[PDB]
Amino acid sequence: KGPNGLIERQVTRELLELFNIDEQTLNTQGLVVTTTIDPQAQRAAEKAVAKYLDGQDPDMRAAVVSIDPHNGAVRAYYGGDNANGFDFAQAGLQTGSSFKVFALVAALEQGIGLGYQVDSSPLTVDGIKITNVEGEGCGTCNIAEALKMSLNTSYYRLMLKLNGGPQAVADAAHQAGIASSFPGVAHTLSEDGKGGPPNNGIVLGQYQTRVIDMASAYATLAASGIYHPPHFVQKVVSANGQVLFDASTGDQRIPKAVADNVTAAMEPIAGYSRGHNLAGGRDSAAKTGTTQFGDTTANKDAWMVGYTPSLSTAVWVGTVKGDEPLVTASGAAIYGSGLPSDIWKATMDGALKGTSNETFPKPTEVGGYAGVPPPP
Numbered sequence: 001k002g003p004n005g006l007i008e009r010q011v012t013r014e015l016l017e018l019f020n021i022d023e024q025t026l027n028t029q030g031l032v033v034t035t036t037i038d039p040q041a042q043r044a045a046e047k048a049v050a051k052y053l054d055g056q057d058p059d060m061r062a063a064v065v066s067i068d069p070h071n072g073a074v075r076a077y078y079g080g081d082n083a084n085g086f087d088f089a090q091a092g093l094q095t096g097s098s099f100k101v102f103a104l105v106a107a108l109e110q111g112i113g114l115g116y117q118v119d120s121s122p123l124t125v126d127g128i129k130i131t132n133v134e135g136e137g138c139g140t141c142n143i144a145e146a147l148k149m150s151l152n153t154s155y156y157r158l159m160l161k162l163n164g165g166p167q168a169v170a171d172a173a174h175q176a177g178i179a180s181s182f183p184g185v186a187h188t189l190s191e192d193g194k195g196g197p198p199n200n201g202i203v204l205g206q207y208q209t210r211v212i213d214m215a216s217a218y219a220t221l222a223a224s225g226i227y228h229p230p231h232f233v234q235k236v237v238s239a240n241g242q243v244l245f246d247a248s249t250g251d252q253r254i255p256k257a258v259a260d261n262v263t264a265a266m267e268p269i270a271g272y273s274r275g276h277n278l279a280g281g282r283d284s285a286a287k288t289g290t291t292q293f294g295d296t297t298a299n300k301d302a303w304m305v306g307y308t309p310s311l312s313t314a315v316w317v318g319t320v321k322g323d324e325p326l327v328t329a330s331g332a333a334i335y336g337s338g339l340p341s342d343i344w345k346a347t348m349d350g351a352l353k354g355t356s357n358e359t360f361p362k363p364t365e366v367g368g369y370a371g372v373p374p375p376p
């Protein structure tokens, strides 16, 4: 029964909203529902999760959501293997560095382009020490290079340069499709939980977001800034044959030029992230994330989110209680470039198998730069 149970739960929820009925009224109707799920994508996601979590800690969990950027359709959805258990694709989770892309959106919207040079040295902000993993830096480098290398220090400085600071990062993320609320969280990306501003940790993905939100927001990027609400229901026909709903019969949230520049910055990242380029030379745009466990040196959540123009997939790996460092069976720390990228690549390759390779739209000038500056 498994992963399809969690899909069914989301379909039911959506039908309830669509028809404004309770579940008993729905169940007795005998509706014939066509979902958006693509079996080929779904099978690829399920296989990838099984493969990469095999032999790992039995407390390890994963979630995968794949969305069609053309229309918001949910093509693959793995929230867990228990139909009657917890849906990890709906859980509020810290995103870590995968959230940096929204700071880049915000920057580009203000005319700060990919070639903007930022210092990567360590700094302290609001009394919190900001550093990069293994003290990595670039001296001073552009914000496209700092995204690829995932420099915390550079992205903190970039956020502070924005008009609105962390609020501008929240605005961009919300505009991209990070939902404003979900169950658990009445006001997302809000320190006071009431709609007030986020604090500076937003750029390092310290707020809770769902895996579905990340897939959807990156879908907006994949669609050159056009947002479509995510949905699971394609068509509904009555038991006796009357069509009641058909999705086959968007909103420019982010400017095309901005979104296409963000894409350009993200293009090298699947490969940079321990060689997770998609099969058959297929281009992609991606971003990893890895959160800290407490104040320890170990990891808590690991992410890979990335897209082609035809599919946006978010993957999270963590543990069931979210209270233990995240490691492999051999003791190795799990980063975004590890198991989540293995799952992401396998899901993407599988879901897109048999389709021709797409190229991304050529970016036009934003902040004085069109695409990633060529290096010296």
Ligand SMILES: *C(=O)[C@@H](NC(=O)COc1ccccc1)[C@@H]1N[C@@H](C(=O)O)C(C)(C)S1
Residues within 6 Å of the ligand: 095, 096, 097, 098, 131, 132, 133, 149, 150, 151, 152, 287, 288, 289, 290, 291, 292, 293, 296, 297, 298, 299, 335, 336, 337
């Ligand atoms: C974003 O996720 C960044 N993550 C970190 O800096 C992790 O920080 C700590 C983790 C454990 C203990 C102390 C600090 C950068 N992005 C990551 C990614 O997966 O893209 C990274 C590992 C490359 S660093």
